[PDB]
């Protein structure tokens, strides 16, 4: 079925995009949470 | 009647399309909800 | 009248086709509405 | 006149055919409108 | 007048032939118009 | 004049035959025109 | 006069022949007109 | 004139046939227009 | 009358041909209407 | 009367020929009307 | 007129669809508002 | 003119059908607008 | 000239027949065109 | 001369017969042309 | 000329039919546009 | 020459009859062409 | 030539009928076009 | 022209619809803005 | 050419109808845009 | 040859009648085609 | 010889009659063919 | 006007919904502002 | 009758053509509906 | 009767010609109707 | 009598010639009717 | 040839009608496109 | 042989008349075919 | 029989022409259907 | 018998001419039917 | 042969008329296609 | 046989006329069908 | 015998005249049939 | 009613989705409020 | 056969016209699809 | 049947075109869905 | 240009709405900033 | 070509509409951005 | 072939119109996309 | 088939459009994500 | 390719808008971050 192959390729492409999205969000959140913890720990320790 | 068999085949084809659509939407929504919960919980815990 | 039996056979065929249509539209609309509710509720619950 | 009786019997046959046509159109229009309203009201409710 | 009798007999023959002709006309024209109206009403009803 | 009486008899006989002929012509044409008009108007009305 | 009596005999004999001729003319003309009208009315009827 | 009376009779017969034709066309056209407007207005309302 | 029997035979033959014509038109019109309604209802269901 | 017997023989002969002619006319017209009606009804049915 | 009864039946069918739609929308909106108020009040109280 | 009464009857039928249409559309539009306002106001009030 | 009188009388007969023919033509053509315009205008107005 | 007088008598008698012949011709030709034009104009009128 | 009067009376009948058609089209177009504007303005206001 | 005078009279008589015939032909054709053109132009205009 | 005058008269009559035909077609076509443009522009404006 | 009056009436009908729509939208927007300002000012003041 | 005046009258009627259309669309579009701006600005200002 | 002159004169008559016929043909066909093109172009332009 | 001279006289007289006959034939045939072609070309022209 | 009554009923229904919306928002805001003031006053007083 | 066999063989050929038509329409309708459902379900899932 | 034999032989010739005619009719009409149905079914299936 | 014997011889000889004439008539009439029916049936068949 | 001039004059009339049609279509298309673009650009700007 | 010379003269005269007849036939047919083709091609081109 | 061979030859010629007609109609119908499906499928794909 | 031999020769001559006539008839009809069928099938195929 | 030259002349005349017909149809079809494509492309661009 | 030669010469004339007729038929029918296909293909391509 | 020799001379002279008659018949019949077929085939060709 | 069963199944499916949504939101809110209370109580107690 | 060559040359001309039609439809369809895809992809990218 | 091969070739052409359509729609839909997912995921990840 | 005036009035109406929006936002912001400053200054001063 | 000038005029009209739209959107967006920045900066500064 | 030049001129006209369409759509789409980007970027930047 | 090449060319054109769309969307989304991240990181760091 | 140039100009216009957007966002963010740092540093230093 052409439709079966089409739907399978669309789902495979979606999975690749999800992989890239997760890589980017990890990098962004790492920085936001890192900066938050640094500012919090520096002031608290002082 | 040829129409009876034709209508039945089209309904079976629609059922196949619904199966493909549900599989893709589960993957798509799963990633969306996962990223949302990840950012939310990370902010609350840190 | 040969027409009386002809018109009757055509109206019986129409009634059969309306039943095949009301079985396909239930399946298709049910799936689309189900996907809509699934995405909506997952977003609100998360 | 023979033509008088002929014209009257033809106008009688035409009236019978009109009745058959009206009965069939009611069923078909009812089905098409029913499916249209079903889809509209379902989408609005969801 | 043998001629008067001849003309009178010729008219009865003509009148009979006219009756036979009218009967066949009604049957044939009724059928053709019946098929015409049948096709027209079926198309509009569908 | 015997010859005059003869001419007068044959002319009177001709007039009789002309009257009989005219009556038959009216009957034949009326039937034909009736059939023609019936077919035409039945086709037009439908 | 014997000659006058002979004339009367000739006239009476001729009258008999005129009657026989009229009977022959009626049947022959009837067939000719009958077949003519049959073909005419059958054509118009069909 | 024999023709004068014959022509008048044929014109009167034509007028009668016109009356029958008008009655039939009114019934048929009325039904076809009614079905058309019914389908149109049902669609607009829905 | 020879013409009487001939006219009756032709009218009977016409009735037989009308029966064959009605059978064929029912089959053809039924198929065309069926294909039309099939395409219409499949579109509405989808 | 020898002349009477002669007229009687020729009239009887004419009647025989008229009967033969009528039979042939029925066969020829029946065929033509059959072909005409077959073509007309075949065109109408389709 | 058949149209009058047909229009009345279609309006009655529309009323039934409206009843089904309102029941579903009350359940759907009830859940949506309930979840929203639940999260809001829990956050304010705690 | 038979047409004057025919056109008048058609315009009277049209006026009746427009009234049946303006009764169905009021019910349908009223319901859809009511559902829209219901969802909108419940969201803002909550 | 008995011939001049014959030709003059023949023309008056022809002129009368032409008047009768024209009267019948106006009635028949008026009706056919009236039905044609009626059907056309009803369809466009609807 | 008695012979010359006899010639004059023959000429006068012939003139009378020519007049009777002309009257007969006028009525017969009038009927023939009248029926011809009647059939022609009735056909064109219808 | 008889045709002159005939053409003029036909052009008069056509003008009357145009008036009837215009009156009907105004009512039908008014209703369709009225329903269209009602739905549009109601949706915009809500 | 008496024979010459005779030929001259018959030729003059023929010319008279030819003139009368031409006048009648113009009247008959004019009527027929008028009816034909009236029907054609009335059909075309509508 | 009698034919020359007759042909010229028939051509003049044809020209008159063309003038009547053009007047009628202008009125009818104008009305049909006007109704068409009216419906089109009302829809575009709404 | 009937179209001129029809277009003017439709424009007047549109003006009425606009008046109804503006009245409803003022009430609808008034409530929306009122609730928004109520919640905002209450939070700021308290 | 009668057509030159006919085509000119049709183009003049078109120009008039375009003006009636450009007066209705200005009113309708103006109202819809006014309602859109009203709702948008009230929301931002509040 | 009085015959040669007769044939030569007959041709000139025929040639004149052909010229008259062609002139009338051009006028009638020009009008019918003009109306045909007028109706076609008006419909496409509108 | 007187007999030979008489023969010559008969031949010369016959030649004169042949000439008169030819003149008569030309005018009569001219009218017959002229009316025939007039009717033929008028029919084709219309 | 059916449209007038429809628009008036829609506005009346909207006013009822606005009444319910205001009742609900007063209850919600009472609680949110009450809890806020309680927490604020309790801590400040302590 | 030869026509009986002819009508039967034509109704047999028509049935064969109906089978070919139904087979083709099933393939084409299946493809169009398949593409329609594919696009709809894909868009909804994404 | 040599005439009876002649009439009998003429009928067999006629009957043979009718058989030949019917055979050719079936072939030609079958082909024309086959092409007609082929074009109709191909268009509807596509 | 020798004269009586001669009469008998003449009658017998005439009978022979009547037979030869009948054979000639049969073949000639057969060809005439055969070609007539051939042309008639070939035309109807095509 | 008269036909040559006739064909040329008809091709000249057709060219004139094409010019009138093009002028009218430009005005109508300009108006419809103008209204379409007006509504589109206004909505986008607001 | 005087008789031979006579036959030779009449045959030569016949050939002359045949040549004149052929010339006239060409002129008449050419005109008729020209008119027929002009009408046909003018109808087809438009 | 000469007619037997002639009828058979004409039927064979008809069969040959049917073969040529079928070949041409297949090519033309195939192209028109192909263009139709090409435009339809390109639109669906886009 | 010399008279018998004469009748036999004329009958043989008639048969020869009948054979020649039949051959010419076949050639003429074949051509006409071929042209008719070519035109019909060429029109149908396209 | 006189007919040979006549047939050749008529075929040449037909070719000339075909040239005039092709010129006119190219101009008319070109204009109608141009107007169609103009309206289509303006709509697509807008 | 001078008759055999006459029949043989008549056939060659007929065969030539058939060749000339067929040539003209091909040219005329080719042109009409060419214009028909041209108009059809231009419309579908556009 | 001188009488027998005279008989032989008469027979030989008659044979010469029969030959001259046959030559005359051939040319006259050829022209009649030639013009008939020319008109027939030109009509079918066009 | 197929619509009744369809609407009932859709509402039942919605109720199931609402059950899952409530389960998920309880789990999420439990964690967010638990973490909030823990952090608040730990710091306050210290 | 001349018809064989004619049918073949017509099928050759039809094939040429199909080629021209296909070339034109490719260009027009390419342009319409190109504009459609351009607008779609541009809107999606922006 | 030539139709059996014709219908088969048309269904084979349809199957080929459906494959070309299912290759273009996969590419187009794939691209549009890919762009949708790209924009959606980039927004959520950032 | 009607469009120019329409666009100018829409822009003027927009400018008025902007004036009202700015008046309302100044009042709202005055209060929010006033309350903020009051609360801030009161506590800071204390 | 008239189309060239028409297309150029429509493109010029589109350019005018774009100029009006850009002017209005600058005013509309200017107010929107101005109010947003006003509220934002006032809150930050105070 | 006159068609070859006709089809070529039509394809050249199509190519010209496609260029005028691709110049208008670029301007219109460019403006709409420009307005979209303008509003989007101003909002994000502010 | 020309369709095969046409479909392939259209798919290649679609691929080109997809390439242009992806390039533009990367630039557009890149700027959008860049501005969002710029504002977010600047606020977090400062 | 017109599409290539169009897509390239759209991308170039987008790049210019991105340049302006970045300039504006730098100015806005400079102020918001500047005010934030000033307020923070002033209070902290004090």
Residue numbers in the entry:
A (entry chain G), B (entry chain F), C (entry chain P), D (entry chain S), E (entry chain N), F (entry chain Q), ...: 5 to 50
Provide text from the study:
Filamentous bacteriophages package their circular, single stranded DNA genome with the major coat protein pVIII and the minor coat proteins pIII, pVII, pVI, and pIX. Here, we report the cryo-EM structure of a ~500 Å long bacteriophage M13 mini variant. The distal ends of the mini phage are sealed by two cap-like complexes composed of the minor coat proteins. We further performed local refinements of the mini phage by dividing the particle into the top, middle and bottom three segments.
The middle part of the M13 miniphage consists of 20 protein layers (from layer 4 to layer 23) of pVIII assembling to form a cylindrical capsid with an outer diameter of ~60 Å and an inner diameter of ~24 Å. Similar to the pVIII assembly in the wild-type phage, the pVIII molecules in the layers overlap with their neighboring subunits, resembling fish scales, and form right-handed spirals in the symmetric cylindrical shell. The helical parameters of the pVIII array determined by the real space search with Relion22, are 36.60° for the twist and 16.36 Å for the helical rise, which are similar to the values of 36.40° for the twist and 16.60 Å for the rise determined by solid-state NMR15. Further helical averaging of the reconstruction improved the overall resolution of the EM map to 2.7 Å. Each pVIII interacts with eight neighboring pVIII proteins in six different layers primarily through hydrophobic interactions, hydrogen bonds and salt bridges. The twist and rise of the helical array are ~36° and ~16 Å, respectively, which are similar to the reported parameters for the helical array of the major coat protein pVIII in previous studies. The inner surface of the capsid is decorated with the positively charged residues K40, K43, K44, and K48, which are clustered in one region of pVIII. The distribution of the positively charge region in the capsid follows the symmetry of the capsid, which, however, is not consistent with that of either the A- or B-form dsDNA. However, the number of contacts varies when a symmetric capsid structure built with the helical averaged map was used. Furthermore, the plot calculated with the symmetric capsid shows no distinct peaks, indicating that the capsid with a uniform and symmetric conformation is unlikely able to establish a unique interaction with the ssDNA and trap the ssDNA at a specific position.
